[PDB]
Structures are given as C-alpha cells and as structure tokens.
Design a protein around this nucleic acid. Structure first.
Lengths: 56, 209, 114, 122, 120
RNA sequence: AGGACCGAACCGACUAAUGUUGAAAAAUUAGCGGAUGACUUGUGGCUGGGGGUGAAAGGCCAAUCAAACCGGGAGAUAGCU
RNA sequence: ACACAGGUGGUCAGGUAGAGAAUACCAAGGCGCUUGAGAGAACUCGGGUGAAGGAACUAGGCAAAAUGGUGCCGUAACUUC
RNA sequence: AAUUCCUUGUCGGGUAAGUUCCGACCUGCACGAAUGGCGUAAUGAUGGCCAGGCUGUCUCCACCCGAGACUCAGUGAAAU
RNA sequence: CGAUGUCGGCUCAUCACAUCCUGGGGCUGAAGUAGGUCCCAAGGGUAUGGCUGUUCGCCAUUUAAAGUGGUACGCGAGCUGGGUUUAGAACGUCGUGAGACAGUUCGGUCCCUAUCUGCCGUGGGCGCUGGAGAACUGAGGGGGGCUGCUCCUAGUACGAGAGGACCGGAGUGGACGCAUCACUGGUGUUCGGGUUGUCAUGCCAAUGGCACUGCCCGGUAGCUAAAUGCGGAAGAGAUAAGUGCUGAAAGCAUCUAAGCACGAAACUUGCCCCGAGAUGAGUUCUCCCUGACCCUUUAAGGGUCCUGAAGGAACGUUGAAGACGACGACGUUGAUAGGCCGGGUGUGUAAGCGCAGCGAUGCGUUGAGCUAACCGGUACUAAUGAACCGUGAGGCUUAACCU
C-alpha cells in the first residue's frame, strides 16, 4: 500500500512520457467568412459551412 | 476438405415431420471466389485464398484492389485462406458455392464470439462467490487468494484473474448440417455458432471422426 | 432478416384458429406409443399466448383428476394437430397467471358472447 | 428439479403423505432430480395405518414436478406440485397399488411400466 | 455490458431525466434554438421530434397526448398551431445539432440544437 | 389506579452494514429499548486528588484516570538502549 | 481545529387523509446541500426483482423476507387468579 | 448441572443422521441450605434447543436501478 | 521481541507420488464374478449432510473414487472471527486474601487509496534497413484429456449349481468446459395497463408530480441460466512395467550382449486458442514515389527550392467493439446514427361522442389507443470542401546469371 524505496526522477519522467498533449492538429477555414475554427464546429462569428447560423 | 466463409444470419427452428424442433443457425454462404492459389514451389504450402461478399469501390484501397484485379475477380469484404488436402485443385477466379456441403453431414463453425468486455472472475472463470452476508466485509465477488506465501512469493503464470472475456476466435466442432440450400445460398446447421448476427463465420468439414 | 422471415413462413401452418386468453380450448396432440400413433386431447383454459410467428406458443391449463397441469404448446408444431375453441371466455388481461392461485369457484371465467 | 431438502407430495397410496428428498442418486455431485429420476427419501408424514411409517428411509421416483418436462418439439409440461411414487428400497417396483394424479410419457421404460399401468392419465 | 441498449442515462435517475427532457423540450419549442451539451442535445432529438409528429395531426386526443408529455399548454399551443403545420411535409429531421465549442466552467462539449426552419 | 400496555417528541444504545489517511478523535443508515417515572431537561449552586463521586464498571472527575491537570524539587534515577 | 452528515434550551404550529405533534402529499415560508461534463467495464456501496428448491448457508436463520389496521367471533397449558 | 476430569457417561425423546437440546439414572473428580437450597406465574434488545411461516442465507447466482470506480476540465492530499 | 498475526471455516490454488478412481501388467491358496498382493503410471477426476468452534472423528445417504502429503501445519495489505487468549460476570476447585485454574460458562473494535516484483488484461514508442495495405507458414506457449449405467455379443466362455465373463460394439447419463438465445424461463425503474393517498393543470372529464419504480400486473430488445447445441476422441510415433522371437558369451539353457516384435489415460503428435519483439524480427501477393541546385572539416554529409504519392492519422456519425486507448462500419457518387414511413411485438378493447342505468358503472364506435433498445425501407437531420502526417527509386561487400 505504500512504496518502500523512493522512486527516482528517471522513473517519474518515464511515467510521464505519455502525459503529453496532442496539438489541434490543423483547424479548418470557413467557406464564406474565411476564418478558422475546429472542424465540424461553428466559428466564433457563428458560421458553419459557409452559411450564417446563430448570430448572437 | 476446404471450407467456405459465411455470415451468421440468425437462428430459427426446423420442425421435422414427426414433430421434433431442431434449433438451427442460418448461415448465408454466397459465392466464395478464389483470389489466390498457393503452391509449395512458391510458398511452402498448398492453400487457397478466397474472398466473399462485395465491398464499395471507394473503400477498397489500391493494394487490395490490385490484388483482386490480378485475380480477375470482384473485390469482396475480406480475404481468408484454406489449407488444401493433397488431391484438391483450384484455379484463380473459380467460384465456390454452398453446394460443396451437399455431402458433408457434419461441420465445424469458427467465428469470433460476442465481446463481453472486462469481465470479473465470476463471469469469466466461474469462480464461486463468497458469502453474501455472515460478516463478509466488501469481498463478495472478489477472487479470494491468488497464491501461497513465502514459498513461491509470486503469482504463477496463467492464474485465473479478471480481464477481457469475449471477442475472440472460437470454433464449435461437429455441428450437424440440417440443410444445404443452393438456391438461396444457405446452410442450416444444428445448434448455436459463435458470434452476433451478421458476424463472419468459417464453415469447414469436421476433422473429428 | 428477409432470409429468416422467408424461411420460417415456409413452415407456418395456415389454419390456426383465432383464440385469445380466457378461452377453453381442446388441443389434439399426436402421441406415439411404440408403433401405434394415437391422438390425445388436452382441454383447458388458455392462460397465455406468445405471438412470434413460427415461434408462437400458448399455455393451456387443465385441472386433471387431481392437480393442475400447464402444457405450453408450440402452435406451429406438427405434434399439435388440432386446436378447437370450446368456450369463448371474457377476461381483461392478456396473461391470466392469477388463476394459478385459484381453484373451483374463484377460478371461474365469464363468457364473452361477442 | 428436485434436490435435497425438498418436500414432495406422494402420488401412490403407500401410506406416506409428504416426504423429503435426502439424496439425488445417480452420480457424484449430481444436483437435481427430475422427470423420472430415482431419489432417496425420508417420510415426514404418514396416514395412521399405511404400509410405510413415519421416518422410514426409502427410494422414490419423481413422477410430477413444478418445473416440468420438455418434449422434443419445445413444448413444456409443468405441474402444480412435485410428486413421487415410493419405490421399494432394495428391489424396486413400488409399494403402493393405486397411483393418484397424472404422470408423464417419460416413465415409459421397463421398470416404471408398472407405474404407468396404473395412473389415470399420460 | 450494454449491447444494443438505447438511451443515455446522463448521470441522473429516471425521473430526473424525464423531467429534464420535458423542460428542455418545452424550451426548444418555445425559443426554437437552445444551447445545451452535446449528449443532452442528442437525447433531446428523440424526445422533441415525436411531439412534432404528434402535432402534425390535430385532434383532442393528440392535444391531450401531447399535454401528458410536455405538461405545458402554451407548448401544445405552438405545437398544433404553429410547428405542426410548419413542418407538415418534412418527414423527420425537425431539428439540427450544431457543435459550438466547450464550456468555460467544466469543459463540456456544448452544441446548439435548433429547429430546422427558423426562416424568420 | 399503575416504577401498567402500544406508540411519536424526549432519553437511550441491542443488532447489522457502511465508515475506519472518516462527513465524525465514536458517527450515519435500517431495524431496536424506555417513554407518568428509581423519568427527562434548562439555569444556578456544592463536593478535589490517596481526595471527590460511584444502582460498583477501577467507572467518572474538561477527547487524560489502579490515583487529574499545571508549575516546581529536577539535568530524579536509568549496572539499559 | 474546517463554510465539519455531530451537539444545542424555550416559543408558534395551516390543509387533505389519519387516533395522532406518526406518516404521505401540500400552504405560508425556505431551499436544490460551492466542483462540473461524460461514459455505462470489473469491483465496492445503497436498492428492485427472480425459475425450481426453501436453512441445504452458518459458529449461529447473521442479514433479508415475512407479519403488521379496525370491528366481530374465538382462544390452551400454567398461574401469585 | 453456568458445577462432571474421565466424557460425545448410560438409557430414553426429537433427527435420515444430534459432541448441542429435553427427560431420566447417580460412580456429586470437585452441589447443598441467607458468600442461601429447591420450586417459581409474569417479565427479559438474556443464554441454549426445536417447529410453522418466510425467504438470494444457500444450491448458484442472473438481470436491472442508482452512488463511486473509468475518461475529460478545475483544484489538489497522505502514510512511506 | 525498534512486531515474521499462529486454530478452524470460506474463496483461490499449486506441486510430490509413498496411487483412492480410471489405464497397463506379474504372482495367486487366480474356475467365473469379486478379490488379495506386488510392479508400472501423476493425464484427468477425487461427496452432500447431522453433531461439534473444531482439524479429526462418529453417524446418515451417496460415489468410479470420496488418496496421502508439501506449499509460513499454502491462503486474514483476500473474507470471517466460532475457538484459543485482554479488560465485565458467575460456577466448581485452590488460596486467609488480592487473585488463580490449555477446568467450565455468558458478553466482547480484525486498518491500509499498491511504489517495486509477480499475475490477469490492454495500449503507446521504436525496431525489423524505401514506404504502405493485406494474407500467411510456424519457432514457441497455453487449453483439453474424468466417467457411470443400460443394451448386444451372451446367459455364451467358466462352473456341480448358485452365479457369470474377457475382448469388441451401440446407446444414454452425471460432473466439467466452450458457445449461444431458436425454444422454456429470469430480469426488463426506458413499454402498456390496474390501483391507494395527496397536490397541481380554473373547474367536470382527462392527465401529470410525489409517496422504495408509491404499490402492483404483464412485457420488447439486450444480458442471462435452470434453457439448448457442441467437446473431451479415434489414429500415429517413441516407450514404462510386462510379454516375447532368433541368439551366443556358457558346444545346453537364455527376451540381450549383435539383431528383431509387441506394449498404458503418462511422453511427442492428432483437436482448440495465442503466436515474427521468432532482434534467428521469416514468407507471399499487391500498391506508391522515376525533380532541380548549392556548400564542406567529401561523408550511407548538410542545406534551399519544387514536389506530398500509396497510405495513415485527425475530425464527424457510430457499433451485438469497448474502462480509456484499441478494434469494426460509414462520411453524401451515403443507410453510420437519429427522426420518419410500413410491419412486428407488448399491453389489452384509449380519448371524445352516443345509448342503457337514479348512480357506481356497462355497452357501441373498438382488438381500440399507446407501443423502448426489434425488423424492412426512406437522405428529412447530422456525418464539409479541405488541411495534417507520410516523399521523390531505397547502403556496402561478395557470388550466380544478364539466353
């Protein structure tokens, strides 16, 4: 239930070798507004696939 | 002999004339068509590689399409391979139908079983549950002990513990073939075969006597 | 499942009479005793009907010279030779399992007559 | 599906009225008796001047069960109450002369032929 | 192990889900576009769209049948008076989900679910 | 009438499960006993350390009790670690 | 020690059903318990249901299940009546 | 026997089978008369045994509903 | 002794063989059946209950059999806590007494979120020498091996009779394991209905909330077992004990020294599964990439421009796949999910209206209405054009061909 020798910083980084974040990896450009957004999501201005939606 | 690749259509029953229901599994066996023949002089073993069904044109890749194009055959949904039995002979592009089982009397059906996910040892290994009362403290379905003491001080290999049950190749042997229907491309075997409905099966003749 | 639907309806018998639970039914059944093939009769109240096409069953409950018997029958079996409805019966449920607890005057089903 | 500790009714007129199963014979770790299976019973109740008295230990064959029997077409036959006929302990063929209630076509064998010579139905 | 079961549980019991979809269906009928989580949108389709198809056939039994579900009388006025004759030829597909990012409070994948006309 | 009966508040604490680096340095949940009495409770007062108090358990006396706590003798003494 | 599932005396006490200050649902009034979103594995906790059997479990019917109200009929041994 | 070592004494009852239980015997290792003897109606969150009912206790587990467990975002310990 | 928890029960094993069963065999005071005894054999199998805290034991009833041991008298960071052995109390006895007795009796807190090894599962990286998509051979590893009874052979062989076979074959069980959901069922708080109390929707009617899903009655799909299918084998090889054949040393005899044949559930295969990290990194098929130009401490060296393939990954709709990754399907030239349409299934004849009745209610329209995960269809909604990763012919030596 508890460790018996203090683990090293080696073993610590080895465990964290997988904790890395993946980048976005490329975010797509709107058809009409020409601005960037996550794919399959609406843009910050509220367009999606070149048509105007929300408009708040 | 060789086998054929089917597809588990589901289960029904077949009332006999003297009133005995037979639980059958319906296996649609379309035209398995040979895409490659393998000889000792090139591969070290005699075996045929068949395909079956049909695949979309845009979903088959260029390696795969070049393989089926060499064979002179329509792309199917997969490639399988059957070892040949020393006096058998097939050609590439030859179609094989359920008619092959018109004599066989008893088959072996190989599929992937239904995946039950991470299963505990009561489901998985039929361990027996400890007391459900009489004092028992948080250990009802747990595996108990897992080994001995200082001697060995290790858990032995292949100790039955919990983990992924299901979703693996299983072969059911010696199933009685009830009907061969060359018209509808069907094979009715007596019993349950592995897999959910629509799963790919592999039906060979029975190797047991 | 057009394969299975096509394949089962090749076996379904055509002249199964319309009955509903509550009905007193005589069912004639092929009973084989060595070489002779007899046909015996089992009359009782339908207490349950499962409709699944070929896999359609129905449970008939008799009180046979003593204690009570429930035969579940496969409707489309070749064993089940005849079904005839003796007394049409008026109940409100669909599965009459409460009658397992009642005998005699309590287990008494009104007649339907419409 | 009769196991140890199960109180069965008695179908013949041997004198017993209510028996208890104490073993299911016929194999090692065998759990259940059933359609026409032999058990060993003890007699928990008797009528006052029957052939078998209370606390005797003898054999019986199960003739009806609440669980029921399955026919080869898929049809089941459940009764309402488990019942046995008390066979003789050493050389079988049972004690009683009448048999009450129905029995099933799965005592159609050599020995129990006697039991289905009696037994007003099936 | 779940095989072929349908219906999200949504970390609620059955009565809180039922109540929650009753409110949220009421809000989508009322405002015609609401922002919710992406799973709650995807379940809201299977609650909301049957009310529209019930509304496509106006009768006293369907008004009462859509007032047992939904439990609000303004809502069963807009269904049967506005939305039912609005769709009226549209066979399913009364509502679209538009994914719209993540919350700030708990990083949940939001989505705007809206009715499929909103031509106003 | 009743150290009467059933049963809430109220007082308690018989069983089980949880909890056991707790939500809690003794509880929670489900049942449980008493419930007009030798009851229970508020506010104040009195009894003090070989002393109190005790329907008695070596119990209780500020989460401490086969002799409280604080300060001092005091850096007790320790053929032991 | 905590913005702690504990402890803390008195006073007011609506509706319907109910014997009732129990209990259920409500009014006045006050709250949603200061981490959320998913998924729907084992296992743990709190629960629901269960074929046939029905204490075979076990140290032991522990736990669970069962019983459960009002009126009337009826009610044994033994007894300090 | 809350007392008995030998001892699971012996006989009887209950049980298919009873080191426990009830009745009896008496060879009381090592009861016994206010450190009370023997009875004793009622009472007991008292000890032991039996039976009816009842049941997932169990045969032998199965499924379901919820809270964690698992993944994501925020905060962020501990024994060792 | 700056703590190595000690009986018994449960769960879970694992090895030994001095073998309980099954298998082979020699001797028998072995007629047969059943035995006794000894050799070989560890594949698999190897009870449920009463009593007791008990291991043990006795008893009851099974069974082919209910093996004997080791594993901290296996197993308390897996469970229990009945016994022993804390603190309370009492009996018998000992002591004047405090107390004491492995004498008895009643009551009596069992913590731990796993770092490392191990183990069960499941992925990421890199390697395998151009990249990629598939199919494979198979080194090696694991699973599985139990067995009763009935019938025939044959009431033959044997025996005076009673009784009663070897060898061989057919059937059908028990226990165990794998799969599955067609059947029989369980569940089915997501479907339908009945019903009690109360609250609300103005009210009647109808509904909804809350009361364990309020209590119930049924029930789809899925999951499931008590359900239903299948399995353990035949055969081959090398043998153990054992039995021999020919045959000397030893002109006989002799199974062994040369040579040869049998011989068992053990051994190697046969059957099922994993499996190229098998660094010894294998094979086969297919697909893709056929540009220029500088610099130097001229190397399988570095850089710039142009190109970006096969394919993968991401994203989305998701799945009888799933803890998460992973795996599978589909992304508009599209049935991947939702909705919709038709069907099925389940419940059981809705609401409104009409009629009968004083009324509760009943009847007609009406097997009505509503129907979850099911089945068959349907682009209505959502699966976006793209971007991202991956390159540009793949080293050296030697050999055989360049027909």
């Amino acid at each position: 239930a508890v460790q018996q020798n203090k683990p090293t910083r080696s073993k610590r980084g080895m465990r964290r070798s997988h904790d890395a974040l993946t980048a976005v990896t490329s975010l797509s450009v709107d058809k009409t507004s020409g601005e960037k957004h996550l794919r399959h999501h609406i843009t910050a201005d509220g367009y999606y696939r070149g048509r105007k939606v929300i408009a708040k | 002999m060789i086998g054929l690749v089917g597809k588990k259509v589901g289960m029904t029953r077949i009332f006999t004339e003297d009133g005995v229901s037979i639980p059958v599994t319906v296996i649609e066996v379309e035209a398995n068509r040979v895409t490659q023949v393998k000889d000792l002089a090139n591969d070290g073993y005699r075996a045929i590689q068949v395909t079956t069904g049909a695949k979309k044109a845009n979903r088959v890749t260029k390696p795969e399409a070049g393989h089926f194009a060499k064979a002179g055959v329509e792309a199917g949904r997969g490639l399988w391979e059957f070892r040949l039995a020393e006096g058998e002979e097939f050609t590439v592009g030859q179609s094989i139908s359920v008619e092959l089982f018109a004599d066989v009397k008893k088959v072996d059906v190989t599929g992937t079983s239904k995946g039950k996910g991470f299963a505990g040892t009561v489901k998985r290994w039929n361990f027996r549950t400890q007391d459900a009362t009489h004092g028992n403290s948080l250990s009802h379905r747990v595996p108990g002990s897992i080994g001995q003491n200082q001697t060995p001080g290790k858990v032995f290999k292949g100790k039955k513990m919990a983990g992924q049950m299901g979703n693996e190749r299983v072969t059911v042997q010696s199933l009685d073939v009830v009907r061969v229907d060359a018209e509808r491309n069907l094979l009715l075997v007596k019993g349950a075969v592995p897999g959910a409905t629509g799963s790919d099966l592999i039906v060979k003749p029975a190797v047991k006597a | 499942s057009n394969i299975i639907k096509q394949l089962e309806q090749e076996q379904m018998k055509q002249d199964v009479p319309s009955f509903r639970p509550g009905d007193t039914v005589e069912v004639k059944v092929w009973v084989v005793e060595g070489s002779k093939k007899r046909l015996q009769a089992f009359e009782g109240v339908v207490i349950a009907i499962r409709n699944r096409g070929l896999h359609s069953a129905f449970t008939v409950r008799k009180i046979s010279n003593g204690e009570g018997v429930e035969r579940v029958f496969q409707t489309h079996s070749p064993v089940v030779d005849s079904i005839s409805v003796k007394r049409r019966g008026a109940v409100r449920k669909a599965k009459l399992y409460y009658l397992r607890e009642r005998t005699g005057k309590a287990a008494r089903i009104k007649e339907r007559l419409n | 599906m009769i196991q140890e500790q199960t109180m069965l009714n008695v179908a013949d007129n041997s004198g017993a009225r209510r028996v208890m199963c104490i073993k299911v014979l016929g194999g090692s770790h065998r759990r259940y008796a059933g359609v026409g299976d032999i058990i060993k019973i003890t007699i928990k109740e008797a009528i006052p001047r029957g052939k078998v008295k209370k606390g005797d230990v003898l054999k019986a064959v199960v003739v009806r069960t609440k669980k029921g029997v399955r026919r080869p077409d898929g049809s089941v036959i459940r009764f309402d109450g488990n019942a046995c006929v008390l066979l003789n302990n050493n050389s079988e063929q049972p004690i009683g002369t009448r048999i009450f209630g129905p029995v099933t076509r799965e005592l159609r064998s050599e020995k129990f032929m006697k039991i289905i010579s009696l037994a007003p139905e099936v | 192990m779940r095989h072929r079961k349908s219906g999200r549980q949504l970390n609620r019991n059955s009565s809180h889900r039922q109540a929650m979809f009753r409110n949220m269906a009421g809000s989508l009928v009322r405002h015609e576009i609401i922002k919710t989580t992406l799973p709650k949108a995807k379940e809201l389709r299977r609650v909301v769209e049957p009310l529209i198809t019930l509304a496509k056939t106006d009768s006293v039994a369907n008004r009462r049948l859509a007032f047992a579900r939904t439990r609000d009388n303004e809502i069963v006025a807009k269904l049967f008076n506005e939305l039912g004759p609005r769709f009226a030829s549209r066979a399913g597909g009364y509502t679209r989900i538009l994914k719209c990012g993540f919350r700030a409070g708990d990083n949940a994948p939001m989505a705007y679910i809206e009715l499929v006309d909103r031509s106003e």
